[PDB]
């Protein structure tokens, strides 16, 4: 999971 | 927005769509390319090809279970592009590049047409 | 094999599937969550959720046009997860995390359940 | 395009  | 994103999600969805295709699960159209037939999902075809997007948004053609491609279309070229649609992987070879490029032009798959043009230009 | 790969292909396919959903194009099921209804593509649902994969591979349920979820399922939680299925983006907030996690457990979406558990553990 |  990432900060897009 | 303040969303988080799962990097592999799109790839995982496509892998599962290809698994469904391989098992003939909820496939809703057969693409006929001369003597050959290819089962697929209309939504995947539309999401990958300008030609299929046009065909399946048509008020009559959206309901067809069989689509017959132009007799000039090469079945192997179509098979390579259908695999690309479901995997992101293009089996581009010296022996098939002309057929793949012609099929991609017909199907309106701009990025494929682009790499075919580039690979051809490098060999001249 | 000796294939080349188009990095953005999977993401572009998913973007187009979401565009089709927004325009209600070739959607083939309505998911009922108490008073709310959500139109979708069975193949996308199966590709994202263990529960939908089970439901639509069932010889009778594969043909249903309406699926009613358990009355305990929160419609907003379902809406957030449905958006995630079609975009890879999860709108996870303090006010919805419990509903999102419960819905993801029910839908069998392991990666979502994982990030919800991690975000909850960080706040305790 | 890349070599996967
Ligand atoms: N399905 C869908 C779809 C939608 Cl909803 N919006 C916009 N394009 C869509 N698909 C589509 C249209 C044109 C082309 C491609 C895909 C690849 C390409 O080279 N040309
Ligand atoms: N459609 C399809 C499908 C296929 Cl074909 N093979 C395998 N899994 C499939 N989908 C599916 C099954 C279990 C889970 C998910 C998706 C996400 C998750 O957390 N659990
Ligand atoms: Cl027909
Ligand atoms: Cl393309
Ligand atoms: Cl029904
Ligand atoms: Cl997930």
DSSP one-letter string for C52-64: HHHHHHSTTGGG-
CB contact under 8 A, D2 and C4: yes
Query: Which tokens is B42 given?
Result: 């209309």
Q: Residue B15 CA to chain centroid, in angstroms?
A: 14
Which residues lie with the beta carbon below 6 Å from any ligand 2 atom? B 16, 19-20; C 46-50, 53, 108-110
Q: Residue with structure tokens 């975000």?
A: C119
Q: Whose CA is nearest to atom 10 of ligand 1?
A: B47
Q: Which domain holds residue B50?
A: 1-124
Q: Residue with structure tokens 């209804």?
A: C37
Expressed in Å, this structure's resolution amounts to 1.7
Elucidation method: X-ray
First to last CA, chain A: 9
Asked if residues C78 and C33 have their Cβ atoms less than 8 Å apart, the reply is: yes
CA distance B43 to B106: 18
Q: Whose CA is nearest to atom 2 of ligand 2?
A: C47
How many folded domains does chain C comprise? 1
- CATH classification of the domain holding B13: 3.30.710.10
Query: Which tokens is B89 given?
Result: 């992987």
């Amino acid at each position: 999971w990432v900060i897009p | 927005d303040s969303c988080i994103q799962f990097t592999r999600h799109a790839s995982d969805v496509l892998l599962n769509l290809n698994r469904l295709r391989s098992r003939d699960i909820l496939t809703d159209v057969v693409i006929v390319v001369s003597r050959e037939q290819f089962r697929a999902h209309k939504t995947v075809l539309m999401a990958c090809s300008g030609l299929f997007y046009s065909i399946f948004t048509d008020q009559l053609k959206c309901n067809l279970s069989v689509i017959n491609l132009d007799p000039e279309i090469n079945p192997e070229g179509f098979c390579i592009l259908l695999d690309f649609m479901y995997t992101s992987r293009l089996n581009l070879r010296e022996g098939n590049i002309m057929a793949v490029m012609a099929t991609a032009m017909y199907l309106q798959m701009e990025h494929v047409v682009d790499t075919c043009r580039k690979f051809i230009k490098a060999s001249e």
